[PDB]
Every structure is written in structure tokens, then in C-alpha cells.
Nucleic acid binder design. Structure first.
Ligand SMILES: [K+]
Ligand SMILES: [K+]
Ligand SMILES: [K+]
Ligand SMILES: [K+]
Ligand SMILES: [K+]
Ligand SMILES: [K+]
Ligand SMILES: [K+]
Ligand SMILES: [K+]
Ligand SMILES: [K+]
Ligand SMILES: [K+]
Ligand SMILES: [K+]
Ligand SMILES: [K+]
Ligand SMILES: [Mg+2]
Ligand SMILES: [Mg+2]
Ligand SMILES: [Mg+2]
Ligand SMILES: [Mg+2]
Ligand SMILES: [Mg+2]
Ligand SMILES: [Mg+2]
Ligand SMILES: [Mg+2]
Ligand SMILES: [Mg+2]
Ligand SMILES: [Mg+2]
Ligand SMILES: [Mg+2]
Ligand SMILES: [Mg+2]
Ligand SMILES: [Mg+2]
Ligand SMILES: [Mg+2]
Ligand SMILES: [Mg+2]
Ligand SMILES: [Mg+2]
Ligand SMILES: [Mg+2]
Ligand SMILES: [Mg+2]
Ligand SMILES: [Mg+2]
Lengths: 259, 141, 145
RNA sequence: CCCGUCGCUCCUACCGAUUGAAUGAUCCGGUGAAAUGUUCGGAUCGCGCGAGAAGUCCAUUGAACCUUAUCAUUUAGAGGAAGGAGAAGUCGUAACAAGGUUUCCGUAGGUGAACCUGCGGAAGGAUCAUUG
RNA sequence: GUUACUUUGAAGAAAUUAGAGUGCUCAAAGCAAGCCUACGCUCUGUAUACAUUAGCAUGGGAUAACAUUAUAGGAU
RNA sequence: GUAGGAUAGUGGCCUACCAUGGUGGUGACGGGUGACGGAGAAUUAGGGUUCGAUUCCGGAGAGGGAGCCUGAGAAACGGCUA
RNA sequence: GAAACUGCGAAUGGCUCAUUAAAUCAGUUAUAGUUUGUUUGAUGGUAUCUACUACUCGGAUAACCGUAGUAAUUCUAGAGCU
């Protein structure tokens, strides 16, 4: 190519969007934004495919251009706006507040939240460094930059951010014994407590996580998001509480429900 | 005996590669000579009828097998093509346009006809089968 | 001593004609020779800390950082100026015959003057940015053998 | 039952004068559009200044062409010489029996053709055998 | 001293293949859809597996390969 | 290899000087391909064999070369210059 | 509100497989070796200093209008505005 690609073929869309194979030749290409294209959920999918408020692309645009949808307390009129992990989606007209979280199967789920819970969100810190004039600052994995951060905060920690004031109200250090959710890989959407951390010089760090039922799994450091201090998450989890159920037990539950 | 060393994979591969050329079928499809043959790797070829020829049948049979000398349009090569069915040579004329197919044995003579590897399928855009059964009529011009 | 070129060779950023003295100054400060540790558990040779050679491509005293792949091999050739050929020997699996064949790779690598290498000894090379047409690796350790 | 020359028809390639031909890619040397940079230049335009076209100078990239040579893929050719196939051709009878001179291998020579002969060799011999 | 080898883990686009669910009238398919007609509900579903070699991390130390041994210039 | 130039930047990418180096029967170099590569397709004891121009990913081209303006991005051709 | 100036886009998409045999390409790496319109989050303190508009600087040009050239082209020259 001679420059940036503006189209996304439907087969090339991320699988967790769950787009029909014969729905069309194209999928909504995520716009530039706080979240990466492969790790986002465009507002068009949320409003049309998931919530079914809009029956078409045109209806999605019509709904959004009325300034009726807010992301992180800010009105967004971009259909392909990348809304990702921990983001808050609010529709004041319908009195609906949603938080984007990964289900046990690794797909974004619109988790309904209370009004109080909709006033804050969690962020993961990438690094802390000095800006111009020697002013310290940190940036999160959702594109945010915060100046004069708490000196105790460091990379890979989780900060509680108040959307109304855009200030850090609390933070969690990345350490063993903290409940976390996996945001990538085959174990995406699972929730557990860190057991130990393996660090290799000049290589990715491995994190070992134990599920509430005792199941053990490991993942990379960049795929681990801390949800609270100790074993109690700071936000409400979706249905299933990040517990991955084997296909056999899922089938047993389905058959039991059938009768 | 065969070589069996665990570090002797290269020799086994090379020996098989060299010995594959002794296989006639492998050599035919890997020497790149199909493009110098009259059909040049095609199932069919069109040509112009030059002359009707009778070919004596091979022993122990005795017959005159009717064939046509055809020049292929795409490369100008001249071949002998058998004209099947009774009295079907009467539907062929000099300077006629004929479609030629293989004789079924992949470039080899068939039956008691010596040195003939092709047959006529169509004449003047009409299949010989239709002409034999009177389903169609040969175009006048 | 090492001024064998048409230009004066010196460590960049190391001021020499200072009115003060580098008594308690760190390496590279106060005119003291600059050196650094490359990490990954590798030890800085004692010949680079107290040497006088100037080599901008030296991992420990130059302007090249080590990142990427760390490879081991045997010194195949040491005829170039500050460059050696490292021969890496490995086995390639031949799937159809379930066997292996011998194979080798020649890897040009920069060798700092702090190392003494000879054709036939084991070396460890770290990856760095392109240094020449074919050189992308820096000698980090030598086993005399 | 069987071998070859010779005689007829057809088919396939091979050699070949023609200092053969075409195309593609590299090699030697030469010319070299256009553009870019540089030197000079100053139609002209605004307030002694600023901007500035045509043109010109030397370089860089370099198409295109010419010369030399080498590879790759095709292709014409008077004529020559091979092989094969084809119901009922001519001359012999070389191989099959000890095939009527056992056969055959290598080498050399010679005869219309099969073939003959010399030297050494093999049994795939027509002898597994003379302490007779 | 250096490797081969084996175990385990991460990560490893979709589509295609295998495969769970689902009466497009059946089927090839598709990713639908089901209860009841509640001004609704099922947080509806849209699983899971596979993936040579080479690379990364981990446990083992049998079978193998390369290097070394005594002019002590050896170990402490 | 040293010092420069150029580049968005590393690099014989280019220039000056210096050294004689670099690859190769573990097949270099040269030639052929009716050779774009892959995800994949056909057939299926197992091992294998054959195919992959074509809707997904990556690359290249716009009759053949070359040069270039605009621009964040092109050596663009439904842009320009030879 | 036509027209026109200004801004942006036209480097995406579609098509094809000619060239290309460690090359493209696959898996796996690196940029501490660079550029990146845009989106998202943060961040902008000294200009006149003796001229001395900042309650706001100056000169043009399109559309328009009217004199046209050429066989001819979103070929093209003057003139009057804003
Ligand atoms: K006959
Ligand atoms: K008969
Ligand atoms: K005889
Ligand atoms: K005999
Ligand atoms: K005679
Ligand atoms: K550079
Ligand atoms: K250099
Ligand atoms: K290619
Ligand atoms: K632009
Ligand atoms: K415009
Ligand atoms: K543009
Ligand atoms: K790759
Ligand atoms: Mg394109
Ligand atoms: Mg006889
Ligand atoms: Mg006789
Ligand atoms: Mg005899
Ligand atoms: Mg340089
Ligand atoms: Mg292909
Ligand atoms: Mg082709
Ligand atoms: Mg097509
Ligand atoms: Mg494509
Ligand atoms: Mg192009
Ligand atoms: Mg054309
Ligand atoms: Mg052209
Ligand atoms: Mg072009
Ligand atoms: Mg066109
Ligand atoms: Mg185009
Ligand atoms: Mg091709
Ligand atoms: Mg490579
Ligand atoms: Mg940017």
C-alpha cells in the first residue's frame, strides 16, 4: 500500500465481534482512539448488533448525531469510536449505564451498572516519566495522560479514576494476592488471584493466576488487569464472575435447564 | 543396504530425488516436453483438413482405417487423426475445420491403427456424433 | 597510543581539558573513561574498563546497545579488522525421512578490542542495530577453549 | 522358428554452408532527452532595496540509442545421414538340436548381407567324473 | 563446559477442516433463535478442538554428540 | 575499519583513505520454472502424493523504462515530465 | 441560496500475477535506529521594549462584468470591480 488503509473486510474483523459471515463484504473499521482496533468494540456494534436500538448503519448514525450516547461521561458522535475495556457507556434518555467487560468466553459484554458505579473507571498504568519542565506524569493503556501522579504509583498498577473530576482517587499496586482479570490471549475474561510472578531478563514476564474454584492458568504481564486489593474486585463483575466452565459442565447445565 | 544414520536425511532425500528420474511417468510430467508436442498440453485443438488418407490395419486384422491429415491452427503442426464410425469420412472435406481430441491412451496408438494418436470430434462446428445420427446437418458454407 | 587514524579518536561527551579533576566522578564524568554494563547477566570485561582503545561500536564503551537475540557459535574467521565470522552449527529436520541433516550459518559479528579471539573458540554474540552491510551482532563473551 | 543387406510408402528426430535470423538479460566503450541541484543572467513587478521569467554554466539521477562479448528461449535452411512402423517383395541361412564349424564377451582386421577369421577370456556347454 | 532429546506452559487472524446448539417444510446451508403474546423475557446463543519446523519459558538427566584430562603452570 | 555526505532514521546507501577480506560438495555462483508467497485445495490406515491465477493476509504492476511536483502519506499513473 | 474562492479527499477501494528463488513470503524478533494528517489525554507566561492600529492592519484575485484569439480542448490573452 501507499498509505493508511481505510477499509476492513468482514472476515478480517476480530472474532469477538461475532459478525455474520454473509452479512456483508465489510465491517466497521475502528477509528483512532484510546483503545486498539483489535481490542475495542465500536459504538456501531453496541447500538446495532448488541442493544438493537438501531436496525441499520443509517439508524446508528441518526441516533449518535442526536448526542444521546456518552462514553466516559463525554458525548461521542463517532460511530466507529473505539470503546474498550473498563469504559463506561451511558444513555441518559434510556437511563442505561454499561461497563465494557470481558466474559468468560473472551467477548465484550455490556454489563449494566448502577448510577454510582458509573461515575468511575479503572485504568492500567503503562509507565511514569518526566515531561517538559520536569513535571512527572503517567499514561494509561487507554490513551490517558495524568500529570503530578502519586509518587507511589508505578507501571502496571491500577488507578481508580473519577470521570466527573478526571482525578485519581485510589490505586492498586501490582502484587501477588490481588484479584485480576485477563484482557488477552486464550484466557481472556477469566478472573483470579495472582500466585507468583516469573521475571526473565530481556523477556516477557509470566503471571500465574488461580481461579476461585482452584483452577490455575498463566499469562503474560501485559494481559493482566488488577481489579482490586486482596480478593474483592473494585467493580461488579459480569455473570459468571470470570469462572470458565468446561464444555461438559456447560452441557450438563444446559440439559438440566431444558427439563 | 539402505542408509539408516539418524543424521543421513540429506542423503536419503537426494537419493530419492535422483532416482525419481528413472520413473517414466515422473519424467514425462517434469521434463517440460509437453509444450513441444502437437497439442502443447491441451485436451483439444482445432485444425484444417489437408487430405484424406487410408491406413492399413495391423496384423492379424485386415482393413483400411480412414484418417485425415490435419494441420493445427495454433502452431502449424501436421498430425493424423482417425475418423470414427461408418461412412463418417464422407462428412470430411479438404480445407474443412475440425476439432481434434486425443485417442484415449495419452499420446499412444490405439487398437490396430498404427501411428495414430488423435481423432476427429467436430467438423465445421458440428459434432461427428450428431452427423452420424442425423441429429444435425453439416453447414453448407 | 590509539591515534592511528587521520582524525582524533575520543569518547563522545567525555570532556578532557577540564579545570577540575575526575576524582570521585562516575565513568564518563570529569574526563574519566566511560563504560557501562550491558545487562542480561553479562559482566563487563576488565580490559574495557581500564583500556585506552576508542571503539564507538563496543558494547561496553561505545554507542551500541544489545537487544534482540543472543546466539552462541564458534569463531570461523578472525581476519577482518574488529570483525569475526561466527559459524553456528545446527540440525535441520527432514520430515519425510524422520531424520536430520547438518547445517550451518555464518554470522558476521563485531568484536571489541577488549576481547582476544581465535579461530575455533566458543563465542556469545548479542544483537544490535545494523553496524555494516552484514554485521548485526556484537561479541559479548569468549571461551578460549 | 528365425537374422541381415537390398527394394517400396509413411512418420520422428539428428548433422549442416548460410562469417544464418529474432527476442530477452548482462559485459566493454560512446552519445545522451527530461528533471533536480549549482553558476551566471535580469524580461518584468512592488516599496537604494525585495521578488523574479526566458536563457546559460557544471554536476547528479538517468530513459533511449550505437559498439563488443557472453548466456537464456525460439526459429529458417540447399543437402546429408540415423531410427521406427506398415497381410502376403528379392538374395542367402547367421541363431535356436553338437542348428550341422558349440555358443557368447573384449579387441583387431576383412567380406553383397547375414557374418568369417586371429589373440586372450566365460559356460549362460554338448563334460559336475580317471587315486587312472 | 556446550548441545541434541523429552515433559509442561504462554503466545500463535479470520475464512476453510473437525465439532456443540438450533425443524431455513427437509437438505446443501445459515448463525440463527426459543416461551408468551407480557407495550416483554431467556444476563438468549453466536462453544470447543486442531495447528510441521523455527523461536520463548519450564521439569528430567536415561540414550546420544562436541570440548577437557598428566611436562601440575592442579584444587584449597 | 576510520572520517564525512545523504537519509525520517541504521547501514558501502554514497565519497576519501586504509586492510584483504567475504561465499562455497553442509552445493556457493550460474541456469530453468508453462515460479508471486501464505492462509489453504484434492486424496485420505499411517507415512505420503499432487495442486494453490482467483474474493482473506503480505508483495508487486498499471503498455516498457526513467524522473518528479503536491502532500502526513505516492517515485501515484481514472497525476505530471522525457 | 446557484456560481466562485478557501479547506479536505482523491496514497483507500477495484483489477491482475508480468517481474521476482533467502528474494517476496510464513512463524518468530528488534527500533536504545526512525517517520506518522487524523482520534483520544494532557500541556501553551517574556514578540512592541526609544516608531508606537489592537474598539481590529495592508495589497491583490475568483465568481461577476466586458474586448477577444484559435479548426480545436475544464486551450488561452488583455480591461473594470469586490
Ligand atoms: K494386416
Ligand atoms: K481379424
Ligand atoms: K556360427
Ligand atoms: K549353442
Ligand atoms: K558381391
Ligand atoms: K542512514
Ligand atoms: K564505513
Ligand atoms: K512475490
Ligand atoms: K494532506
Ligand atoms: K475545491
Ligand atoms: K490529499
Ligand atoms: K516474517
Ligand atoms: Mg490498494
Ligand atoms: Mg545355421
Ligand atoms: Mg553351416
Ligand atoms: Mg554354428
Ligand atoms: Mg556514518
Ligand atoms: Mg496465490
Ligand atoms: Mg501465469
Ligand atoms: Mg480474475
Ligand atoms: Mg490481495
Ligand atoms: Mg505503484
Ligand atoms: Mg494493455
Ligand atoms: Mg508509460
Ligand atoms: Mg508511474
Ligand atoms: Mg485505467
Ligand atoms: Mg488508482
Ligand atoms: Mg510469472
Ligand atoms: Mg531471511
Ligand atoms: Mg500522531
Amino acid at each position: 500500500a501507499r498509505g493508511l488503509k481505510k477499509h476492513l473486510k468482514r472476515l478480517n474483523a476480530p472474532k469477538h465481534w461475532m459478525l455474520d459471515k454473509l452479512g456483508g463484504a465489510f465491517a466497521p473499521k475502528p477509528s483512532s482512539g484510546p483503545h486498539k482496533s483489535r481490542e475495542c468494540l465500536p459504538l456501531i456494534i453496541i447500538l446495532r448488533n448488541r442493544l438493537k436500538y438501531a436496525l441499520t448503519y443509517r439508524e446508528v448514525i441518526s441516533i449518535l448525531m442526536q448526542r444521546q450516547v456518552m462514553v466516559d461521561s463525554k458525548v461521542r458522535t463517532d460511530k466507529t469510536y473505539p470503546a474498550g475495556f473498563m469504559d463506561v457507556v451511558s444513555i441518559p434518555k434510556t437511563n442505561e449505564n454499561f461497563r465494557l467487560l470481558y466474559d468468560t468466553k473472551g467477548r465484550f459484554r455490556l454489563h449494566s451498572v448502577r448510577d454510582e458505579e458509573a461515575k468511575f473507571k479503572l485504568c492500567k498504568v503503562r509507565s511514569v516519566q518526566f515531561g517538559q519542565k520536569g513535571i512527572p506524569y503517567l499514561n494509561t493503556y487507554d490513551g490517558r495522560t495524568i500529570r503530578y501522579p502519586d509518587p507511589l504509583i508505578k507501571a502496571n498498577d491500577t488507578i481508580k479514576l473519577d470521570l466527573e473530576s478526571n482525578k485519581i482517587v485510589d490505586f492498586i499496586k501490582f502484587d501477588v494476592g490481588n484479584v485480576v482479570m485477563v484482557t488477552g490471549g486464550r484466557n481472556r475474561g477469566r478472573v483470579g488471584v495472582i500466585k507468583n510472578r516469573e521475571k526473565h531478563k530481556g523477556s516477557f514476564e509470566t503471571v500465574h493466576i488461580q481461579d476461585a474454584l482452584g483452577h490455575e492458568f498463566a499469562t503474560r504481564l501485559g494481559n493482566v488487569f488488577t481489579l482490586g486489593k486482596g480478593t474483592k474486585p473494585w467493580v461488579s463483575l459480569p455473570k459468571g464472575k470470570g469462572i470458565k466452565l468446561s464444555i461438559i459442565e456447560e452441557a450438563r447445565k444446559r440439559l438440566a435447564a431444558q427439563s | 543396504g539402505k542408509t539408516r544414520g539418524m543424521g543421513a536425511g540429506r542423503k536419503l532425500k537426494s537419493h530419492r530425488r535422483r532416482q525419481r528420474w528413472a520413473d517414466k511417468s515422473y519424467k514425462k510430467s517434469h521434463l517440460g516436453n509437453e509444450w513441444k508436442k502437437p497439442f502443447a498440453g491441451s485436451s483439444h485443438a482445432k485444425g484444417i483438413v489437408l487430405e484424406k488418407i487410408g491406413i492399413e490395419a495391423k496384423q492379424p486384422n485386415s482393413a483400411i482405417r480412414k484418417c485425415a491429415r490435419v494441420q493445427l491452427i495454433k502452431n502449424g503442426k501436421k498430425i493424423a487423426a482417425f475418423v470414427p464410425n461408418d461412412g463418417c469420412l464422407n462428412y470430411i472435406e479438404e480445407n474443412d475445420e475440425v476439432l481434434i481430441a486425443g485417442f484415449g491412451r495419452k499420446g499412444h496408438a490405439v487398437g490396430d491403427i498404427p501411428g495414430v494418436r488423435f481423432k476427429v470430434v467436430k467438423v465445421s462446428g458440428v459434432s461427428l456424433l450428431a452427423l452420424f445420427k442425423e441429429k444435425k446437418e453439416k453447414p453448407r458454407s | 597510543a590509539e591515534q592511528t587514524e587521520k582524525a582524533f579518536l575520543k569518547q563522545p561527551g567525555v570532556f578532557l581539558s577540564s579545570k577540575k579533576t575526575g576524582k570521585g566522578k562516575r565513568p564518563g564524568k570529569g574526563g574519566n573513561r566511560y563504560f557501562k554494563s550491558i545487562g542480561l547477566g553479562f559482566k563487563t570485561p576488565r580490559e574495557a574498563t581500564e583500556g585506552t582503545y576508542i571503539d564507538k561500536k563496543c558494547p561496553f564503551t561505545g554507542n551500541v546497545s544489545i537487544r534482540g537475540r543472543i546466539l552462541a557459535g564458534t569463531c570461523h574467521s578472525a581476519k577482518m579488522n574488529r570483525t569475526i565470522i561466527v559459524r553456528r552449527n545446527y540440525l535441520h529436520y527432514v520430515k519425510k525421512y524422520q531424520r536430520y541433516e547438518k547445517r550451518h550459518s555464518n554470522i558476521p559479528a563485531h568484536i571489541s578490542p577488549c576481547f582476544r579471539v581465535k579461530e575455533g573458540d566458543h563465542v556469545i554474540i548479542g544483537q544490535c542495530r545494523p553496524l555494516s552491510k552484514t554485521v548485526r551482532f556484537n561479541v559479548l563473551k569468549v571461551i578460549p577453549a
